[model samples]
Target: ATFEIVNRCSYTVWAAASKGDAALDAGGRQLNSGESWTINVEPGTNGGKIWARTDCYFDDSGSGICKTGDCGGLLRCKRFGRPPTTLAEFSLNQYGKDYIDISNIKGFNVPMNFSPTTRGCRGVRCAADIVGQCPAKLKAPGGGCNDACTVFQTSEYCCTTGKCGPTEYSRFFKRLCPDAFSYVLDKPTTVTCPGSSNYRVTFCPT
Candidate 1:
């Protein structure tokens, strides 16, 4: 499956992704406003994720830290990104099915749209002004909104026991982006798509 990632934000975004055990596009690419990048995901690729890093200043060596979604201080990320970042996650050809979702389980930085380009599959979008409306304690310092689970770390917020229910913070995210995975048990947010469908991930989507 091919995934096209686009940046529609006014500012630049350093896009990053990890597919299977490898980093896609050498793990990161700089996408200026209106620019895009595409990656081919092989069959059986699972636990893959794509995200954007903001407020980054990389040297020619591609070494720098981003305010949000920093991946080990290197543009070519070999590891998953830090939290307080919006996520476009995928599992292609897992048991002959494709799965995709927009996850704010860790929190959110950029607004995003994760959509299939074929088969009429439904897309998941999270474009609310979460950063602007974030609660005082859940707001990160530089940018992005932190999840209550990360801030509180209690079973009530994190759902560590697998029996926890929604909290005020989770409700806040769900009210804004109903289709996004707002918390650990947000199972309805996942979308099933055709096995071979291509996708598009848009950042700061309008």
Candidate 2:
């Protein structure tokens, strides 16, 4: 499969992706406003995610940190980046279908649009001002919003016991971005397309 990543944000962003043990595109790249990138992903990739990192500064050795979506302070991410990130997640050829969706399960940093451009399948977008409207309890330090689970760590928010449902905080996120997975058990937000479809991920989409 392939991924076309476009940066439509007003500020700079570092794009990153992870799947299995492989770090797509060396895990990260700098994309100033209006710039774009392309990724040729490996076949049968599962549990894949692509997201943007903001307010980052890396040294000559590709070692540094980001305010949001930082992954071990490395330019080439070795694993999933930290949250307060808008994620484009997918699984290819899973049960004969391509599973794709936008997730705010960790919280939201930037707006995003994820689309598959092969069949008549629809796409998903979460372009709301979640950061500005975030409740104080869920506000992240540097920027963006945090999930109730991240802030409280209680079962009501974390679902550690595997028995949980929507709360005021989850509803807050769902109300703002219905197309995204607002909580851990959010299922209706997922979209399925043909396995062979190609995809495009846009950051800070209007």
Taken over the whole model, the C-alpha lDDT of each candidate is 0.88, 0.89
Q: List the residue pairs that clash in candidate 2.
A: none
lDDT of 1 by residue, 1-206 (tens): 78899999999999999863678657889999999999777777889999999999899999989999998888988778877989999888888789999988889999999999998489999999998999899999978999998888899888888998878899889988898988888757789898878999999988
Q: Each candidate: how many clashes?
A: 0, 0
Cα lDDT tens digits for candidate 2, 1-206 = 88989999999999998873669767889999999888877767889999999999999999999999998898887688887888899988887789899988889999999998678589999999999999998999988998888888898788788888999999999999999988888767889898778999999889
Q: For model 2, state the Cα shift of residue 197 in Å.
A: 0.9
Which ranges in model 2 have alpha carbons more than 4 Å from their true place?
Answer: none
Off by over 4 Å in 1: 19-21
lDDT of 1: 0.88
Minimal lDDT window, size 10, model 2: 19-28
